[PDB]
């Protein structure tokens, strides 16, 4: 269940394809609103190649749905992201996550 | 302390009601911890375990006029400290959402103060109870064993604190009776995570009455944001621009939304 | 359980000195329109998102103190239920985001103009972005206090106010029945932009500490026997007022009678109730209040530019909010009345 609220309009010229690395600055928060992770604080773009299982399924699906230069409100169900088991100390069990991603470039 | 025939309770007594020196000013009460609804929603042992409805009762002591006692729930974002307070004076707003054709598909109302007037309901003490269901998203107000027509619906995720606004009218003013209805899990179960499935009503030391102080101290920020303003356009109107960024590091109390 | 820690960005709210409020007798139109365009906004200057919000706020409850405030901090216009606003994608009131569908469906961007539409008689606020209305509108807000436009920028923006119709050309034509913002400027002071409740103000020699700002509420806009010897004094004052009318031409008996009919209001005010100057000023204030009440009964409401079909009047304001010129004219008329009373030889106790 990826319902992307288009925060900023995307270019629409290109979309992610298998074998291409994706560059994002994903800001994350829980359903209650508290922030758990913000790559922006690290100040380093997160790089991952689409197609493999490097990232969670929900993030990959949202990136595939998203376009270059588009900011979207990424909502993930507990089934697609973590679930009954999660990262100990960070993500509570069976809790939804609300990601905020934006694609600087697609490579 | 909890009695055999009476659940544990907190009572408020005026120290010097008889003395003329003591003031009779307006005062507000707010319990220490909140009650939180689920992020998303739809005496018998089974019903009790699955019950999503909680109950607290407040007993107005004899000799206190019910007209001055306002009982209900309070949103944490509450800052009204009016000397003379009325439910009509409560700030409220209704948000209506429609489609392109103008059809109203969703309509919601949100306010920072959800209470009913004691005088609106009505020399014997009357107990005013509030039934809240977490999974229902709405609450029912049953006072003195009789249900009331008025009721409210809340947002999916919001915080709510028990609260009563009472004007001093007697030496013994009011009582917070934390008790559970036969089929209603007591407020203590939803109050703490550990006692979620505990039917027995308990009053841990954390819960306490927090009155509304009018003025509290605060620290001035060392550097403020620089903002410039001028009427830069004869037809472009006034313009404002800020360039220097500034950030501040703060802590969040999870019990009450504050920084 | 533990105290979560994170850094945020500072927020500051600015408003014009315009005040708009509804009351039983207040001379307010009840419907206003203004537009704001964004020249340039940086999407991200700091780790946290820069938020831009445009809306209205109460003059009695809006307290956006720079700091933690409520919620997570960075309290904007919609942080408290006192004030209202939106960020361009979500309506904001009471620190909750309301997802409202918009045809553009994007945040505030450079070269984008946003506008507001609110009614005071019917409690509803609507907005228009890029000339198109928002799907969802506000409703059922409290009418207590006075409203004003306000914007809450987050640490960086290039935005210009186009609320002033005479001060700035409107980007879009206002909807019918909505007066321009600049039409509600108070005659006492010129339009300017000042921060709300700014307790510190920067100074040349050093920072200047500012106390609690005092502002007028909606109550500010809110507006029996004739003795026979007093009737003889009124005839003498009728002769004096015929002389006054002759002076105003720049003493016929019918002219004196017409002047007495005109001054019957002042005669009734005197019958109802240095020291002479103070009494004259009080009588002039009461007369101006009666004139304002009569205008309100005629449906008149104050505006910057007076229109006869719209019943707008430059003096459709209380005596306290009235200009100094009208007060001086009333004082001169009351001084003429005091001279007539001194000539009559009977003086009331002040």
XYZ file of C-alpha atoms in Angstrom:
716
model
C 0.000 0.000 0.000
C 2.134 2.843 -1.353
C 0.001 6.000 -1.608
C 2.521 8.667 -2.605
C 1.328 12.206 -1.887
C 3.259 14.245 -4.458
C 4.979 16.827 -2.275
C 6.992 18.263 -5.183
C 6.243 17.699 -8.883
C 8.611 15.307 -10.595
C 10.376 15.849 -13.893
C 8.759 12.753 -15.400
C 11.439 12.355 -18.075
C 12.959 9.217 -16.526
C 11.871 6.493 -14.110
C 13.950 3.927 -12.199
C 14.836 0.743 -14.070
C 16.550 -2.474 -13.029
C 20.322 -2.167 -12.792
C 20.278 1.586 -12.072
C 21.441 2.957 -8.731
C 19.016 5.320 -6.996
C 20.111 8.370 -4.991
C 17.732 9.663 -2.313
C 17.738 11.672 0.908
C 15.048 9.752 2.791
C 13.632 11.350 5.941
C 11.706 8.849 8.047
C 9.171 9.095 10.854
C 6.857 6.725 12.688
C 3.066 6.741 12.483
C 2.851 8.716 15.736
C 5.083 11.404 14.169
C 8.391 10.905 15.991
C 11.493 10.880 13.794
C 13.612 7.721 13.893
C 15.934 8.215 10.914
C 16.800 11.123 8.641
C 19.604 10.568 6.140
C 19.630 14.380 5.772
C 21.141 14.598 9.284
C 23.954 12.315 8.033
C 24.232 14.791 5.081
C 25.244 11.880 2.792
C 22.959 10.720 -0.076
C 21.802 7.084 0.405
C 22.759 5.034 -2.660
C 21.148 1.698 -3.509
C 20.685 -0.242 -6.738
C 17.109 -1.235 -7.556
C 16.188 -4.822 -8.366
C 17.990 -6.576 -5.521
C 16.978 -7.020 -1.870
C 19.347 -4.317 -0.595
C 16.474 -2.187 0.738
C 13.012 -2.988 2.083
C 10.302 -3.930 -0.405
C 8.153 -0.886 0.364
C 11.001 1.550 -0.256
C 11.836 -0.154 -3.559
C 8.195 -0.098 -4.682
C 7.867 3.577 -3.779
C 11.094 4.447 -5.588
C 9.835 2.599 -8.669
C 6.554 4.522 -8.464
C 8.374 7.804 -7.801
C 10.133 9.870 -10.469
C 13.304 11.946 -10.593
C 13.130 15.151 -8.577
C 9.839 14.169 -6.922
C 9.166 14.353 -3.184
C 6.529 11.895 -1.987
C 5.019 10.839 1.339
C 5.876 7.136 1.481
C 3.444 5.049 3.546
C 4.274 1.394 4.220
C 2.136 -1.339 5.760
C 3.774 -3.544 8.429
C 3.541 -6.501 6.034
C 5.854 -4.911 3.453
C 8.210 -3.195 5.944
C 9.534 -5.162 8.930
C 6.480 -6.476 10.774
C 6.261 -8.590 13.917
C 10.071 -8.421 14.034
C 11.992 -5.196 13.480
C 15.268 -3.478 14.211
C 15.667 -3.840 18.008
C 15.493 -0.447 19.687
C 14.463 1.575 16.611
C 11.292 0.215 14.968
C 8.564 -1.147 17.283
C 6.891 -4.395 16.187
C 4.004 -4.293 13.688
C 4.227 -0.508 13.359
C 3.746 1.411 10.121
C 6.350 3.862 8.832
C 5.980 7.134 6.921
C 9.025 7.837 4.752
C 9.796 11.158 3.059
C 12.041 10.570 0.036
C 13.301 12.687 -2.856
C 15.336 11.494 -5.831
C 18.317 13.722 -6.635
C 19.303 11.639 -9.664
C 18.933 8.164 -11.138
C 22.012 6.219 -12.216
C -6.024 4.821 49.749
C -8.237 2.285 48.004
C -11.166 1.058 50.093
C -12.864 -2.333 50.083
C -16.184 -0.875 48.885
C -14.703 2.194 47.149
C -12.049 2.322 44.395
C -8.899 4.367 45.071
C -9.595 8.059 44.645
C -8.047 11.527 44.688
C -9.974 14.303 46.438
C -9.453 18.073 46.425
C -10.154 20.019 49.621
C -9.906 23.777 50.088
C -7.524 24.601 52.930
C -9.110 27.844 54.188
C -12.613 28.027 52.722
C -13.982 29.371 56.005
C -11.192 31.931 56.318
C -11.719 35.177 54.414
C -8.011 35.471 53.550
C -8.091 32.550 51.103
C -8.921 33.374 47.491
C -11.832 31.981 45.475
C -10.145 32.337 42.091
C -10.761 30.149 39.052
C -8.748 26.931 38.923
C -8.220 24.067 36.477
C -7.250 20.421 37.013
C -5.369 18.080 34.679
C -4.178 14.551 35.447
C -0.487 13.873 34.941
C -0.606 11.274 32.163
C -2.576 11.132 28.884
C -4.902 8.592 27.279
C -3.947 7.691 23.708
C -6.161 6.257 20.976
C -5.039 3.600 18.518
C -3.315 4.725 15.328
C -6.043 3.073 13.236
C -9.417 1.729 14.345
C -12.394 -0.114 12.881
C -17.629 -8.710 34.814
C -17.480 -11.361 32.030
C -13.755 -12.288 31.693
C -13.674 -12.380 27.849
C -15.540 -9.062 27.260
C -13.350 -7.400 29.941
C -10.116 -8.516 28.209
C -11.322 -7.326 24.752
C -13.071 -4.180 26.104
C -11.770 -1.005 24.361
C -13.940 1.283 26.550
C -12.473 2.972 29.675
C -14.231 4.693 32.579
C -13.316 7.291 35.190
C -15.771 8.893 37.592
C -15.585 12.281 39.296
C -17.757 12.870 42.363
C -18.910 16.413 43.129
C -19.082 16.688 46.911
C -22.232 17.883 48.651
C -22.487 21.625 49.162
C -20.818 22.357 45.808
C -23.026 23.803 43.087
C -22.982 21.601 39.952
C -23.258 24.777 37.852
C -19.616 25.665 38.587
C -18.283 22.141 37.886
C -17.319 21.404 34.266
C -16.272 17.797 33.628
C -14.716 16.200 30.568
C -11.466 15.693 28.670
C -8.745 18.127 27.628
C -6.405 18.142 24.653
C -2.733 18.667 25.618
C -2.681 21.776 23.385
C -4.744 23.754 25.900
C -3.785 27.291 26.924
C -7.102 28.922 27.910
C -6.791 30.532 31.346
C -9.921 32.691 31.385
C -10.963 33.928 34.821
C -14.613 33.344 33.855
C -14.808 30.240 31.670
C -17.786 28.887 29.727
C -18.275 26.090 27.211
C -19.500 28.598 24.618
C -16.220 30.508 25.018
C -14.296 27.313 24.168
C -12.374 27.626 20.921
C -13.544 25.150 18.293
C -13.312 24.643 14.541
C -14.969 22.289 12.053
C -13.073 21.206 8.934
C -15.097 20.256 5.852
C -13.527 18.456 2.889
C -15.226 18.162 -0.494
C -14.612 17.102 -4.072
C -14.365 19.097 -7.303
C -18.149 18.844 -7.759
C -18.742 20.372 -4.312
C -20.089 17.203 -2.687
C -19.082 16.969 0.978
C -17.438 13.564 1.409
C -15.639 14.087 4.741
C -16.422 16.479 7.594
C -14.645 16.575 10.954
C -14.628 18.800 14.035
C -11.666 19.230 16.385
C -11.412 21.238 19.601
C -8.977 21.479 22.502
C -11.672 21.099 25.186
C -14.269 18.300 25.383
C -16.457 18.627 28.479
C -20.088 18.917 29.536
C -21.499 21.425 32.000
C -22.534 20.045 35.371
C -25.411 22.512 35.426
C -26.427 21.379 31.941
C -26.932 17.843 33.255
C -28.757 19.182 36.326
C -28.692 18.232 48.341
C -26.974 14.994 47.318
C -23.616 14.360 45.680
C -23.799 13.484 41.980
C -21.163 11.284 40.345
C -20.251 12.246 36.774
C -18.756 9.448 34.686
C -17.193 9.428 31.222
C -17.078 6.388 28.929
C -14.285 6.430 26.332
C -13.724 3.741 23.702
C -10.305 3.694 22.047
C -11.302 1.577 19.040
C -14.685 3.263 18.525
C -13.269 6.768 18.081
C -16.179 8.285 20.033
C -17.080 8.714 23.695
C -20.282 8.472 25.726
C -20.925 10.470 28.900
C -22.947 8.583 31.529
C -23.299 10.626 34.725
C -25.173 9.475 37.845
C -26.027 6.204 36.098
C -27.883 7.940 33.243
C -26.557 8.464 29.728
C -26.402 11.925 28.164
C -27.448 12.880 24.643
C -24.277 14.870 23.950
C -21.244 12.971 22.660
C -18.071 13.671 20.699
C -15.961 11.966 18.040
C -12.171 12.281 18.039
C -9.402 12.041 15.465
C -7.691 8.662 14.910
C -4.536 9.686 16.818
C -4.894 12.211 19.637
C -4.003 12.580 23.304
C -6.590 13.180 26.018
C -6.161 13.936 29.723
C -8.890 13.641 32.370
C -9.804 17.123 33.540
C -12.429 18.995 35.554
C -12.827 22.769 35.902
C -14.401 23.563 39.279
C -14.948 26.903 41.043
C -14.373 26.884 44.829
C -17.733 26.552 46.575
C -17.147 24.463 49.729
C -14.421 23.201 52.048
C -14.666 19.734 50.466
C -14.838 20.410 46.743
C -14.473 17.393 44.454
C -13.208 13.802 44.201
C -11.484 11.836 41.413
C -12.829 8.286 41.702
C -10.746 5.946 39.523
C -13.217 3.033 39.203
C -14.124 0.432 36.541
C -17.675 -0.280 35.259
C -18.656 -3.985 35.355
C -17.902 -4.462 31.616
C -15.582 -1.408 31.301
C -11.799 -1.786 31.880
C -10.655 0.903 34.378
C -8.618 3.894 33.262
C -5.518 2.496 34.990
C -5.250 -0.325 32.440
C -4.974 2.095 29.518
C -2.946 4.499 31.665
C 0.164 2.275 31.709
C 1.414 -0.369 29.293
C 2.288 -2.987 31.924
C -1.193 -3.088 33.497
C -3.025 -3.176 30.151
C -4.813 -6.450 30.987
C -5.267 -5.790 34.721
C -8.962 -5.453 35.681
C -8.130 -4.205 39.187
C -8.117 -0.381 39.442
C -4.836 1.036 40.746
C -3.422 4.524 41.358
C 0.360 4.637 40.824
C 2.205 7.663 42.246
C 2.821 9.177 38.792
C -0.838 10.152 38.392
C -1.511 13.481 40.099
C -3.545 16.647 39.648
C -1.698 19.367 37.717
C -3.232 22.817 38.094
C -2.788 25.612 35.548
C -0.227 28.164 36.678
C -0.769 31.489 34.867
C 2.869 32.492 34.251
C 5.939 30.254 33.985
C 9.586 31.130 33.448
C 11.306 30.665 30.095
C 14.735 31.244 28.563
C 15.323 33.799 25.827
C 17.041 32.361 22.735
C 20.585 33.634 22.306
C 20.239 34.275 18.558
C 16.947 35.204 16.926
C 16.038 34.902 13.257
C 16.798 38.099 11.337
C 13.814 39.187 9.217
C 13.732 42.227 6.923
C 10.581 44.008 5.756
C 9.826 46.902 3.410
C 7.374 48.049 0.737
C 9.606 47.188 -2.209
C 6.869 47.431 -4.847
C 4.491 50.193 -5.891
C 2.430 47.425 -7.515
C 4.300 44.416 -6.066
C 3.278 45.158 -2.473
C 5.335 44.620 0.650
C 8.173 42.092 0.510
C 9.965 40.152 3.256
C 13.147 38.091 2.968
C 15.227 36.037 5.402
C 18.558 34.477 4.447
C 20.485 33.377 7.547
C 19.499 29.865 8.698
C 19.324 29.003 12.380
C 18.634 25.745 14.215
C 17.978 24.855 17.851
C 18.193 21.515 19.667
C 15.318 20.547 21.958
C 13.910 17.630 23.943
C 10.368 16.254 23.754
C 8.371 15.033 26.749
C 6.371 12.042 25.441
C 3.665 12.357 28.096
C 2.614 15.835 26.925
C 3.489 17.307 23.538
C 5.998 19.954 24.639
C 9.483 21.197 23.830
C 9.374 7.020 28.733
C 12.743 8.647 27.999
C 13.197 12.243 26.834
C 13.657 12.096 23.065
C 16.079 14.693 21.697
C 16.376 16.303 18.256
C 17.211 19.643 16.642
C 14.690 21.837 14.805
C 14.666 25.158 12.954
C 13.445 28.503 14.254
C 10.121 29.926 13.066
C 8.859 33.515 13.021
C 5.441 34.937 12.146
C 4.834 38.402 10.693
C 1.564 40.256 10.158
C 0.293 43.594 8.892
C -1.306 45.952 11.392
C -4.698 45.248 9.783
C -7.323 44.089 12.287
C -10.633 42.513 11.243
C -13.276 41.447 13.750
C -17.010 40.848 13.998
C -19.315 42.269 16.668
C -22.926 43.324 17.174
C -22.322 46.953 16.211
C -18.809 46.906 14.771
C -18.388 48.482 11.327
C -16.790 45.537 9.534
C -17.567 44.285 6.033
C -17.566 40.634 7.095
C -15.710 39.311 4.034
C -12.143 40.005 2.920
C -9.711 38.792 0.266
C -5.938 38.981 -0.119
C -3.281 37.200 -2.168
C 0.355 36.318 -1.457
C 2.918 35.243 -4.058
C 6.146 33.375 -3.319
C 9.121 34.838 -5.174
C 11.576 32.128 -4.089
C 11.585 29.361 -1.483
C 14.495 27.007 -0.804
C 13.057 23.491 -0.337
C 15.757 22.529 2.162
C 18.316 24.835 3.799
C 18.561 22.873 7.075
C 18.191 19.166 7.913
C 14.517 19.712 8.763
C 11.996 20.766 6.134
C 11.359 24.459 5.691
C 7.614 24.977 6.125
C 5.703 27.870 4.559
C 2.148 28.507 5.731
C -0.362 31.272 4.987
C -3.475 31.827 7.058
C -5.318 33.923 9.613
C -4.839 34.288 13.358
C -6.649 35.712 16.366
C -5.147 38.761 18.057
C -5.899 37.408 21.553
C -4.725 33.790 21.364
C -1.950 33.544 18.769
C 1.292 33.312 20.775
C 4.022 31.923 18.476
C 6.882 32.443 20.899
C 10.188 31.509 19.203
C 11.180 28.232 20.829
C 9.688 24.850 21.596
C 6.088 26.006 21.816
C 3.844 22.965 21.415
C 4.151 19.656 19.619
C 7.641 19.150 18.230
C 8.495 22.845 17.841
C 8.567 25.172 14.890
C 4.991 26.189 15.667
C 3.435 27.732 12.571
C 0.140 29.498 12.020
C -1.872 26.275 12.304
C -0.026 24.918 15.347
C -2.715 26.150 17.756
C -6.488 26.015 17.361
C -6.504 29.785 17.935
C -5.120 30.383 14.429
C -5.696 28.833 11.013
C -3.680 28.144 7.887
C -2.275 25.550 5.525
C 1.063 24.621 3.950
C -0.258 24.245 0.383
C -0.953 20.504 0.590
C -2.432 20.056 4.075
C -4.735 22.290 6.090
C -3.202 23.106 9.475
C -5.193 23.753 12.649
C -4.381 22.612 16.173
C -1.056 21.015 15.151
C -2.700 18.407 12.911
C -2.384 18.030 9.140
C -5.619 17.755 7.159
C -5.100 16.218 3.690
C -6.973 18.503 1.281
C -6.986 17.684 -2.423
C -5.657 20.417 -4.704
C -5.489 20.431 -8.522
C -1.843 21.502 -8.407
C -1.037 19.067 -5.568
C 2.391 20.475 -4.738
C 3.964 22.554 -1.999
C 4.404 26.296 -2.194
C 6.928 27.054 -4.936
C 8.610 30.165 -6.356
C 6.422 32.221 -8.701
C 3.259 30.804 -7.107
C 0.453 33.012 -5.771
C -1.872 31.898 -2.966
C -4.947 33.710 -1.669
C -7.531 33.527 1.108
C -11.309 33.903 1.210
C -13.078 34.253 4.554
C -16.522 35.364 5.703
C -17.230 36.781 9.154
C -21.038 36.670 9.093
C -20.870 33.007 8.020
C -17.882 31.363 9.765
C -16.051 29.828 6.799
C -12.527 30.314 5.437
C -11.691 29.282 1.868
C -8.468 29.541 -0.103
C -7.434 29.761 -3.758
C -4.027 28.644 -5.064
C -2.999 29.681 -8.595
C -6.561 30.899 -9.156
C -8.193 27.585 -8.240
C -10.098 27.000 -4.982
C -9.122 24.379 -2.429
C -11.413 21.350 -2.253
C -11.811 21.560 1.541
C -12.595 24.739 3.473
C -12.638 25.736 7.132
C -15.864 26.296 9.046
C -17.445 27.018 12.431
C -14.597 29.040 13.937
C -14.985 31.319 16.941
C -15.747 34.952 16.106
C -14.259 36.348 19.330
C -11.373 38.755 18.874
C -9.950 40.290 15.716
C -8.478 38.409 12.754
C -5.453 39.285 10.629
C -3.373 37.735 7.838
C -0.122 36.115 8.926
C 2.629 33.979 7.382
C 5.061 31.665 9.194
C 8.340 31.203 7.330
C 10.943 28.619 8.362
C 14.484 30.033 8.367
C 14.457 30.961 4.677
C 12.034 32.424 2.131
C 11.660 35.126 -0.525
C 7.956 36.014 -0.287
C 6.087 39.276 -0.898
C 2.711 40.432 0.404
C 0.094 41.463 -2.161
C -2.709 41.959 0.376
C -2.707 45.719 -0.185
C -4.756 46.407 -3.297
C -3.536 49.988 -3.567
C -0.101 48.964 -2.273
C 0.116 46.118 -4.792
C -1.735 44.978 -7.903
C -3.730 41.809 -7.273
C -2.585 38.735 -9.180
C -6.158 37.402 -9.407
C -9.552 39.084 -9.423
C -11.212 38.799 -5.999
C -14.438 36.791 -5.871
C -17.633 38.864 -5.624
C -18.500 40.136 -2.162
C -14.885 40.030 -0.928
C -13.307 43.384 -0.100
C -9.569 43.992 -0.575
C -7.354 43.785 2.487
C -6.037 47.343 2.135
C -9.606 48.661 2.430
C -9.578 47.758 6.149
C -6.488 49.786 7.109
C -7.086 51.720 10.320
C -7.001 55.521 9.837
C -4.980 56.011 13.038
C -1.766 54.392 11.770
C -0.229 53.626 8.391
C 0.109 50.067 7.131
C 3.287 48.303 8.243
C 4.690 44.837 8.907
C 5.608 44.027 12.510
C 6.251 40.726 14.311
C 3.555 39.474 16.666
C 4.283 39.998 20.378
C 7.990 40.569 19.709
C 9.334 40.786 23.258
C 12.866 41.586 22.041
C 13.615 44.181 19.378
C 17.038 44.778 17.857
C 18.541 48.175 18.587
C 21.534 50.160 17.326
C 23.324 50.563 20.660
C 21.971 47.264 21.977
C 18.982 44.917 21.924
C 15.804 46.605 23.143
C 13.564 44.698 25.547
C 9.873 45.083 24.678
C 7.043 44.571 27.140
C 3.600 43.094 26.465
C 2.101 44.827 23.444
C -1.365 46.269 24.074
C -3.847 46.013 21.199
C -7.510 46.937 20.918
C -10.016 44.086 21.042
C -13.300 43.794 19.137
C -14.986 45.878 21.851
C -13.107 48.921 20.530
C -14.901 48.684 17.176
C -18.216 48.433 19.060
C -19.894 51.906 19.189
C -34.407 62.261 28.995
C -36.421 65.352 29.957
C -36.314 68.849 28.467
C -36.702 71.633 31.059
C -38.564 74.774 29.938
C -35.714 77.116 30.865
C -33.550 74.667 28.936
C -35.991 75.216 26.058
C -35.403 78.977 26.244
C -31.656 78.293 26.318
C -32.221 76.057 23.284
C -33.925 78.947 21.476
C -30.913 81.135 22.277
C -28.648 78.343 21.017
C -30.835 78.176 17.899
C -30.080 81.839 17.242
C -26.399 81.087 17.880
C -26.561 78.129 15.479
C -28.189 80.335 12.843
C -25.164 82.600 13.262
C -22.950 79.505 12.981
C -24.699 78.489 9.749
C -24.169 82.013 8.414
C -20.471 81.643 9.252
C -20.409 78.226 7.551
C -21.842 79.867 4.426
C -18.608 81.903 4.207
C -30.044 85.189 10.742
C -33.523 84.302 9.470
C -35.968 82.773 11.932
C -36.651 79.694 9.727
C -32.881 79.226 9.443
C -32.657 79.322 13.242
C -35.471 76.762 13.465
C -33.674 74.466 11.010
C -30.448 74.845 12.997
C -32.346 73.979 16.188
C -33.757 70.889 14.479
C -30.217 69.911 13.467
C -28.859 70.507 16.994
C -31.736 68.697 18.706
C -29.417 65.695 18.978
C -26.936 67.733 21.025
C -29.830 69.182 23.032
C -31.060 65.679 23.897
C -27.511 64.591 24.746
C -27.187 67.534 27.142
C -30.607 66.742 28.629
C -29.542 63.139 29.262
C -26.469 64.278 31.210
C -10.796 72.699 31.728
C -13.886 70.989 33.152
C -16.035 72.627 30.472
C -13.614 71.324 27.838
C -13.841 67.804 29.286
C -17.650 67.909 29.295
C -17.609 69.233 25.721
C -15.301 66.402 24.643
C -17.557 63.834 26.324
C -20.626 65.286 24.593
C -18.823 65.252 21.237
C -17.798 61.624 21.776
C -21.393 60.688 22.609
C -22.646 62.496 19.507
C -20.117 60.738 17.286
C -21.132 57.415 18.849
C -24.779 58.205 18.065
C -23.818 59.050 14.476
C -21.922 55.755 14.182
C -24.913 53.868 15.601
C -27.187 55.544 13.048
C -24.755 54.593 10.274
C -24.709 50.987 11.518
C -28.516 50.989 11.513
C -28.171 52.100 7.879
C -25.740 49.227 7.247
C -22.653 51.434 6.958
C -19.209 49.932 7.527
C -15.750 51.475 7.540
C -13.447 51.229 4.531
C -10.279 52.927 3.324
C -12.141 54.299 0.282
C -15.712 55.428 0.918
C -18.335 54.231 -1.574
C -21.906 55.531 -1.393
C -23.454 52.397 -3.006
C -21.395 50.228 -0.630
C -22.336 52.476 2.341
C -18.638 52.848 3.178
C -17.713 55.853 5.310
C -14.270 57.113 6.382
C -15.774 58.118 9.749
C -17.617 54.813 10.282
C -15.446 54.246 13.369
C -15.827 54.918 17.096
C -14.670 58.237 18.501
C -11.677 56.557 20.154
C -10.594 55.136 16.781
C -11.659 58.301 14.936
C -9.089 60.603 13.366
C -7.847 63.767 15.057
C -9.453 66.060 12.461
C -13.001 64.911 13.244
C -12.250 65.217 16.962
C -10.985 68.772 16.417
C -14.099 69.709 14.425
C -16.351 68.260 17.134
C -14.332 70.133 19.767
C -14.792 73.389 17.842
C -18.550 72.813 17.606
C -18.691 72.010 21.326
C -16.654 75.143 22.088
C -19.213 77.186 20.156
C -21.918 75.470 22.218
C -20.005 76.296 25.416
C -19.756 79.944 24.357
C -23.514 79.955 23.744
C -24.082 78.427 27.192
C -21.833 81.047 28.806
C -23.852 83.730 27.040
C -27.036 82.110 28.348
C -25.770 82.470 31.924
C -26.694 78.933 33.046
C -23.898 76.386 33.514
C -24.368 72.733 34.436
C -22.195 71.038 37.035
C -19.177 69.362 35.331
